[PDB]
PDB file of all heavy atoms in Angstrom:
ATOM      1  N   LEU A   1      31.088  11.004  13.679  1.00 46.73           N
ATOM      2  CA  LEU A   1      32.271  10.201  13.949  1.00 46.73           C
ATOM      3  C   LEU A   1      32.185   8.889  13.195  1.00 46.73           C
ATOM      4  O   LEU A   1      31.103   8.438  12.806  1.00 46.73           O
ATOM      5  CB  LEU A   1      32.438   9.909  15.457  1.00 46.73           C
ATOM      6  CG  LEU A   1      32.642  11.054  16.460  1.00 46.73           C
ATOM      7  CD1 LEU A   1      32.576  10.502  17.871  1.00 46.73           C
ATOM      8  CD2 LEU A   1      33.968  11.784  16.250  1.00 46.73           C
ATOM      9  N   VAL A   2      33.351   8.275  13.025  1.00 45.13           N
ATOM     10  CA  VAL A   2      33.456   6.905  12.536  1.00 45.13           C
ATOM     11  C   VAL A   2      33.462   5.989  13.755  1.00 45.13           C
ATOM     12  O   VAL A   2      33.749   6.449  14.869  1.00 45.13           O
ATOM     13  CB  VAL A   2      34.715   6.683  11.676  1.00 45.13           C
ATOM     14  CG1 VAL A   2      34.666   7.504  10.367  1.00 45.13           C
ATOM     15  CG2 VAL A   2      35.962   6.975  12.457  1.00 45.13           C
ATOM     16  N   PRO A   3      33.127   4.709  13.600  1.00 41.14           N
ATOM     17  CA  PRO A   3      33.009   3.826  14.768  1.00 41.14           C
ATOM     18  C   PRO A   3      34.231   3.781  15.674  1.00 41.14           C
ATOM     19  O   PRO A   3      34.058   3.726  16.899  1.00 41.14           O
ATOM     20  CB  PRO A   3      32.736   2.457  14.133  1.00 41.14           C
ATOM     21  CG  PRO A   3      31.938   2.822  12.892  1.00 41.14           C
ATOM     22  CD  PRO A   3      32.623   4.075  12.373  1.00 41.14           C
ATOM     23  N   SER A   4      35.452   3.776  15.121  1.00 39.79           N
ATOM     24  CA  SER A   4      36.640   3.696  15.977  1.00 39.79           C
ATOM     25  C   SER A   4      36.738   4.902  16.903  1.00 39.79           C
ATOM     26  O   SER A   4      37.283   4.794  18.003  1.00 39.79           O
ATOM     27  CB  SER A   4      37.912   3.599  15.121  1.00 39.79           C
ATOM     28  OG  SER A   4      38.013   4.759  14.315  1.00 39.79           O
ATOM     29  N   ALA A   5      36.254   6.066  16.459  1.00 39.78           N
ATOM     30  CA  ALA A   5      36.290   7.280  17.272  1.00 39.78           C
ATOM     31  C   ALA A   5      35.192   7.246  18.327  1.00 39.78           C
ATOM     32  O   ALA A   5      35.369   7.755  19.442  1.00 39.78           O
ATOM     33  CB  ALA A   5      36.125   8.520  16.376  1.00 39.78           C
ATOM     34  N   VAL A   6      34.040   6.670  17.977  1.00 40.03           N
ATOM     35  CA  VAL A   6      32.988   6.478  18.964  1.00 40.03           C
ATOM     36  C   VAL A   6      33.496   5.623  20.106  1.00 40.03           C
ATOM     37  O   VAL A   6      33.207   5.890  21.282  1.00 40.03           O
ATOM     38  CB  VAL A   6      31.743   5.847  18.326  1.00 40.03           C
ATOM     39  CG1 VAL A   6      30.690   5.570  19.429  1.00 40.03           C
ATOM     40  CG2 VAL A   6      31.199   6.757  17.231  1.00 40.03           C
ATOM     41  N   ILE A   7      34.233   4.562  19.780  1.00 40.20           N
ATOM     42  CA  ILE A   7      34.748   3.708  20.843  1.00 40.20           C
ATOM     43  C   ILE A   7      35.639   4.517  21.765  1.00 40.20           C
ATOM     44  O   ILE A   7      35.541   4.410  23.002  1.00 40.20           O
ATOM     45  CB  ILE A   7      35.479   2.493  20.255  1.00 40.20           C
ATOM     46  CG1 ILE A   7      34.459   1.540  19.621  1.00 40.20           C
ATOM     47  CG2 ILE A   7      36.275   1.810  21.352  1.00 40.20           C
ATOM     48  CD1 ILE A   7      34.993   0.614  18.587  1.00 40.20           C
ATOM     49  N   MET A   8      36.513   5.357  21.189  1.00 43.83           N
ATOM     50  CA  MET A   8      37.382   6.144  22.062  1.00 43.83           C
ATOM     51  C   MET A   8      36.567   7.042  22.964  1.00 43.83           C
ATOM     52  O   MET A   8      36.868   7.165  24.145  1.00 43.83           O
ATOM     53  CB  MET A   8      38.346   7.010  21.279  1.00 43.83           C
ATOM     54  CG  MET A   8      39.276   6.294  20.389  1.00 43.83           C
ATOM     55  SD  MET A   8      40.500   7.502  19.821  1.00 43.83           S
ATOM     56  CE  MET A   8      39.612   8.603  18.770  1.00 43.83           C
ATOM     57  N   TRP A   9      35.553   7.725  22.407  1.00 42.32           N
ATOM     58  CA  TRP A   9      34.716   8.586  23.229  1.00 42.32           C
ATOM     59  C   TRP A   9      33.993   7.783  24.298  1.00 42.32           C
ATOM     60  O   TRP A   9      33.912   8.200  25.460  1.00 42.32           O
ATOM     61  CB  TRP A   9      33.694   9.304  22.346  1.00 42.32           C
ATOM     62  CG  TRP A   9      34.274  10.430  21.540  1.00 42.32           C
ATOM     63  CD1 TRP A   9      35.562  10.561  21.083  1.00 42.32           C
ATOM     64  CD2 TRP A   9      33.567  11.588  21.089  1.00 42.32           C
ATOM     65  NE1 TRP A   9      35.697  11.738  20.374  1.00 42.32           N
ATOM     66  CE2 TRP A   9      34.483  12.380  20.347  1.00 42.32           C
ATOM     67  CE3 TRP A   9      32.250  12.019  21.226  1.00 42.32           C
ATOM     68  CZ2 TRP A   9      34.121  13.596  19.749  1.00 42.32           C
ATOM     69  CZ3 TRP A   9      31.870  13.244  20.580  1.00 42.32           C
ATOM     70  CH2 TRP A   9      32.812  14.006  19.881  1.00 42.32           C
ATOM     71  N   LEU A  10      33.394   6.656  23.892  1.00 45.40           N
ATOM     72  CA  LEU A  10      32.664   5.812  24.822  1.00 45.40           C
ATOM     73  C   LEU A  10      33.525   5.483  26.019  1.00 45.40           C
ATOM     74  O   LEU A  10      33.025   5.423  27.146  1.00 45.40           O
ATOM     75  CB  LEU A  10      32.196   4.527  24.128  1.00 45.40           C
ATOM     76  CG  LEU A  10      30.999   4.739  23.205  1.00 45.40           C
ATOM     77  CD1 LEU A  10      30.573   3.434  22.610  1.00 45.40           C
ATOM     78  CD2 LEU A  10      29.856   5.337  24.014  1.00 45.40           C
ATOM     79  N   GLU A  11      34.833   5.311  25.801  1.00 47.49           N
ATOM     80  CA  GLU A  11      35.712   4.908  26.898  1.00 47.49           C
ATOM     81  C   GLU A  11      36.000   6.048  27.863  1.00 47.49           C
ATOM     82  O   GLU A  11      36.350   5.786  28.999  1.00 47.49           O
ATOM     83  CB  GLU A  11      37.018   4.357  26.339  1.00 47.49           C
ATOM     84  CG  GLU A  11      37.120   2.845  26.392  1.00 47.49           C
ATOM     85  CD  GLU A  11      37.757   2.304  25.125  1.00 47.49           C
ATOM     86  OE1 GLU A  11      38.522   3.073  24.493  1.00 47.49           O
ATOM     87  OE2 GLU A  11      37.517   1.101  24.788  1.00 47.49           O
ATOM     88  N   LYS A  12      35.836   7.315  27.470  1.00 50.99           N
ATOM     89  CA  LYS A  12      36.087   8.391  28.427  1.00 50.99           C
ATOM     90  C   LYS A  12      34.818   9.055  28.947  1.00 50.99           C
ATOM     91  O   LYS A  12      34.898   9.825  29.906  1.00 50.99           O
ATOM     92  CB  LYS A  12      36.991   9.474  27.801  1.00 50.99           C
ATOM     93  CG  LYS A  12      38.355   8.965  27.325  1.00 50.99           C
ATOM     94  CD  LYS A  12      39.171   8.419  28.492  1.00 50.99           C
ATOM     95  CE  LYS A  12      40.685   8.404  28.173  1.00 50.99           C
ATOM     96  NZ  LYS A  12      41.547   8.577  29.424  1.00 50.99           N
ATOM     97  N   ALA A  13      33.656   8.783  28.347  1.00 48.63           N
ATOM     98  CA  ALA A  13      32.505   9.662  28.536  1.00 48.63           C
ATOM     99  C   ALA A  13      31.974   9.654  29.966  1.00 48.63           C
ATOM    100  O   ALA A  13      31.460  10.678  30.421  1.00 48.63           O
ATOM    101  CB  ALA A  13      31.391   9.295  27.554  1.00 48.63           C
ATOM    102  N   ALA A  14      32.068   8.540  30.697  1.00 48.09           N
ATOM    103  CA  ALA A  14      31.594   8.548  32.083  1.00 48.09           C
ATOM    104  C   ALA A  14      32.346   9.577  32.928  1.00 48.09           C
ATOM    105  O   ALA A  14      31.725  10.378  33.640  1.00 48.09           O
ATOM    106  CB  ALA A  14      31.708   7.152  32.715  1.00 48.09           C
ATOM    107  N   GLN A  15      33.687   9.533  32.912  1.00 46.82           N
ATOM    108  CA  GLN A  15      34.473  10.558  33.602  1.00 46.82           C
ATOM    109  C   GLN A  15      33.974  11.968  33.257  1.00 46.82           C
ATOM    110  O   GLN A  15      33.871  12.829  34.134  1.00 46.82           O
ATOM    111  CB  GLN A  15      35.960  10.434  33.235  1.00 46.82           C
ATOM    112  CG  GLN A  15      36.783   9.450  34.044  1.00 46.82           C
ATOM    113  N   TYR A  16      33.634  12.220  31.993  1.00 49.83           N
ATOM    114  CA  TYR A  16      33.429  13.585  31.516  1.00 49.83           C
ATOM    115  C   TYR A  16      31.977  13.894  31.168  1.00 49.83           C
ATOM    116  O   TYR A  16      31.718  14.801  30.358  1.00 49.83           O
ATOM    117  CB  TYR A  16      34.343  13.858  30.310  1.00 49.83           C
ATOM    118  CG  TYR A  16      35.779  13.691  30.741  1.00 49.83           C
ATOM    119  CD1 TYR A  16      36.417  12.449  30.652  1.00 49.83           C
ATOM    120  CD2 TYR A  16      36.476  14.746  31.319  1.00 49.83           C
ATOM    121  CE1 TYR A  16      37.733  12.278  31.104  1.00 49.83           C
ATOM    122  CE2 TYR A  16      37.781  14.586  31.763  1.00 49.83           C
ATOM    123  CZ  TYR A  16      38.405  13.351  31.662  1.00 49.83           C
ATOM    124  OH  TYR A  16      39.703  13.193  32.115  1.00 49.83           O
ATOM    125  N   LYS A  17      31.025  13.176  31.767  1.00 47.15           N
ATOM    126  CA  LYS A  17      29.637  13.354  31.370  1.00 47.15           C
ATOM    127  C   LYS A  17      29.297  14.833  31.264  1.00 47.15           C
ATOM    128  O   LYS A  17      28.614  15.252  30.325  1.00 47.15           O
ATOM    129  CB  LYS A  17      28.702  12.641  32.351  1.00 47.15           C
ATOM    130  CG  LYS A  17      28.204  11.292  31.820  1.00 47.15           C
ATOM    131  CD  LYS A  17      27.137  10.656  32.724  1.00 47.15           C
ATOM    132  N   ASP A  18      29.816  15.650  32.192  1.00 49.25           N
ATOM    133  CA  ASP A  18      29.412  17.054  32.261  1.00 49.25           C
ATOM    134  C   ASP A  18      29.884  17.828  31.042  1.00 49.25           C
ATOM    135  O   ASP A  18      29.182  18.725  30.549  1.00 49.25           O
ATOM    136  CB  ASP A  18      29.957  17.691  33.532  1.00 49.25           C
ATOM    137  CG  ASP A  18      29.035  17.483  34.710  1.00 49.25           C
ATOM    138  OD1 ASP A  18      27.898  17.009  34.471  1.00 49.25           O
ATOM    139  OD2 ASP A  18      29.436  17.759  35.866  1.00 49.25           O
ATOM    140  N   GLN A  19      31.074  17.504  30.547  1.00 48.30           N
ATOM    141  CA  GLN A  19      31.617  18.264  29.444  1.00 48.30           C
ATOM    142  C   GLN A  19      30.852  18.022  28.169  1.00 48.30           C
ATOM    143  O   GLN A  19      30.834  18.889  27.281  1.00 48.30           O
ATOM    144  CB  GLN A  19      33.076  17.921  29.230  1.00 48.30           C
ATOM    145  CG  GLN A  19      33.930  18.858  30.005  1.00 48.30           C
ATOM    146  CD  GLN A  19      35.198  18.230  30.419  1.00 48.30           C
ATOM    147  OE1 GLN A  19      36.082  17.983  29.580  1.00 48.30           O
ATOM    148  NE2 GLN A  19      35.324  17.960  31.707  1.00 48.30           N
ATOM    149  N   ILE A  20      30.232  16.858  28.037  1.00 52.97           N
ATOM    150  CA  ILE A  20      29.603  16.518  26.775  1.00 52.97           C
ATOM    151  C   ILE A  20      28.085  16.480  26.887  1.00 52.97           C
ATOM    152  O   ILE A  20      27.416  15.993  25.972  1.00 52.97           O
ATOM    153  CB  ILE A  20      30.160  15.195  26.236  1.00 52.97           C
ATOM    154  CG1 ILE A  20      29.852  14.073  27.216  1.00 52.97           C
ATOM    155  CG2 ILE A  20      31.653  15.311  26.041  1.00 52.97           C
ATOM    156  CD1 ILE A  20      29.753  12.737  26.524  1.00 52.97           C
ATOM    157  N   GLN A  21      27.517  16.981  27.987  1.00 54.15           N
ATOM    158  CA  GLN A  21      26.056  16.983  28.117  1.00 54.15           C
ATOM    159  C   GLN A  21      25.368  17.653  26.913  1.00 54.15           C
ATOM    160  O   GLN A  21      24.306  17.193  26.463  1.00 54.15           O
ATOM    161  CB  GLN A  21      25.637  17.695  29.395  1.00 54.15           C
ATOM    162  CG  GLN A  21      25.848  16.933  30.747  1.00 54.15           C
ATOM    163  CD  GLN A  21      25.214  15.517  30.903  1.00 54.15           C
ATOM    164  OE1 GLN A  21      24.860  14.828  29.927  1.00 54.15           O
ATOM    165  NE2 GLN A  21      25.077  15.092  32.168  1.00 54.15           N
ATOM    166  N   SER A  22      25.959  18.740  26.379  1.00 55.33           N
ATOM    167  CA  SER A  22      25.266  19.534  25.355  1.00 55.33           C
ATOM    168  C   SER A  22      25.168  18.824  24.018  1.00 55.33           C
ATOM    169  O   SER A  22      24.429  19.295  23.139  1.00 55.33           O
ATOM    170  CB  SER A  22      25.956  20.884  25.134  1.00 55.33           C
ATOM    171  OG  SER A  22      27.187  20.724  24.457  1.00 55.33           O
ATOM    172  N   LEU A  23      25.921  17.742  23.806  1.00 52.10           N
ATOM    173  CA  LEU A  23      25.759  17.000  22.560  1.00 52.10           C
ATOM    174  C   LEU A  23      24.323  16.552  22.433  1.00 52.10           C
ATOM    175  O   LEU A  23      23.797  15.925  23.336  1.00 52.10           O
ATOM    176  CB  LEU A  23      26.638  15.772  22.520  1.00 52.10           C
ATOM    177  CG  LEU A  23      28.078  15.950  22.099  1.00 52.10           C
ATOM    178  CD1 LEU A  23      28.809  14.594  22.222  1.00 52.10           C
ATOM    179  CD2 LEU A  23      28.085  16.422  20.712  1.00 52.10           C
ATOM    180  N   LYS A  24      23.679  16.865  21.309  1.00 52.06           N
ATOM    181  CA  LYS A  24      22.311  16.411  21.114  1.00 52.06           C
ATOM    182  C   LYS A  24      22.201  15.295  20.097  1.00 52.06           C
ATOM    183  O   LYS A  24      21.289  14.479  20.181  1.00 52.06           O
ATOM    184  CB  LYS A  24      21.413  17.598  20.687  1.00 52.06           C
ATOM    185  CG  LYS A  24      21.357  18.676  21.769  1.00 52.06           C
ATOM    186  CD  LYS A  24      20.010  19.385  21.803  1.00 52.06           C
ATOM    187  CE  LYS A  24      19.912  20.429  20.758  1.00 52.06           C
ATOM    188  NZ  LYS A  24      19.117  21.618  21.245  1.00 52.06           N
ATOM    189  N   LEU A  25      23.136  15.205  19.172  1.00 54.09           N
ATOM    190  CA  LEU A  25      22.981  14.276  18.064  1.00 54.09           C
ATOM    191  C   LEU A  25      24.376  13.888  17.634  1.00 54.09           C
ATOM    192  O   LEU A  25      25.231  14.764  17.491  1.00 54.09           O
ATOM    193  CB  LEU A  25      22.197  14.914  16.885  1.00 54.09           C
ATOM    194  CG  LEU A  25      22.099  14.138  15.558  1.00 54.09           C
ATOM    195  CD1 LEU A  25      21.250  12.869  15.729  1.00 54.09           C
ATOM    196  CD2 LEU A  25      21.485  15.009  14.464  1.00 54.09           C
ATOM    197  N   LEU A  26      24.596  12.586  17.444  1.00 51.75           N
ATOM    198  CA  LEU A  26      25.852  12.028  16.969  1.00 51.75           C
ATOM    199  C   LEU A  26      25.523  11.227  15.720  1.00 51.75           C
ATOM    200  O   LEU A  26      24.672  10.324  15.771  1.00 51.75           O
ATOM    201  CB  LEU A  26      26.494  11.113  18.048  1.00 51.75           C
ATOM    202  CG  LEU A  26      27.709  10.300  17.586  1.00 51.75           C
ATOM    203  CD1 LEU A  26      28.845  11.227  17.203  1.00 51.75           C
ATOM    204  CD2 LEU A  26      28.186   9.283  18.647  1.00 51.75           C
ATOM    205  N   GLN A  27      26.123  11.596  14.579  1.00 48.64           N
ATOM    206  CA  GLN A  27      26.056  10.711  13.428  1.00 48.64           C
ATOM    207  C   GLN A  27      27.241   9.769  13.480  1.00 48.64           C
ATOM    208  O   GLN A  27      28.360  10.182  13.823  1.00 48.64           O
ATOM    209  CB  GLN A  27      26.110  11.464  12.110  1.00 48.64           C
ATOM    210  CG  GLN A  27      25.208  12.599  12.006  1.00 48.64           C
ATOM    211  CD  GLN A  27      25.644  13.308  10.870  1.00 48.64           C
ATOM    212  OE1 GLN A  27      26.612  14.087  10.972  1.00 48.64           O
ATOM    213  NE2 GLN A  27      25.034  13.007   9.699  1.00 48.64           N
TER     214      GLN A  27
END
């Protein structure tokens, strides 16, 4: 991701921790 997209994800990730648990690596 680019930084602006990381910010968007960061803003939803607590609600959805379960959906994104399998992510192992983010560039």
Side-chain angles (χ1 to χ4, degrees), residues 1-14 16 18-27:
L1 298 172
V2 295
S4 61
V6 176
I7 289 158
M8 300 190 291
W9 285 28
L10 284 182
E11 256 140 26
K12 301 298 202 150
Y16 300 90
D18 274 350
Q19 268 150 71
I20 62 153
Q21 285 305 19
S22 72
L23 277 176
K24 298 213 279 216
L25 172 67
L26 171 64
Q27 312 167 279

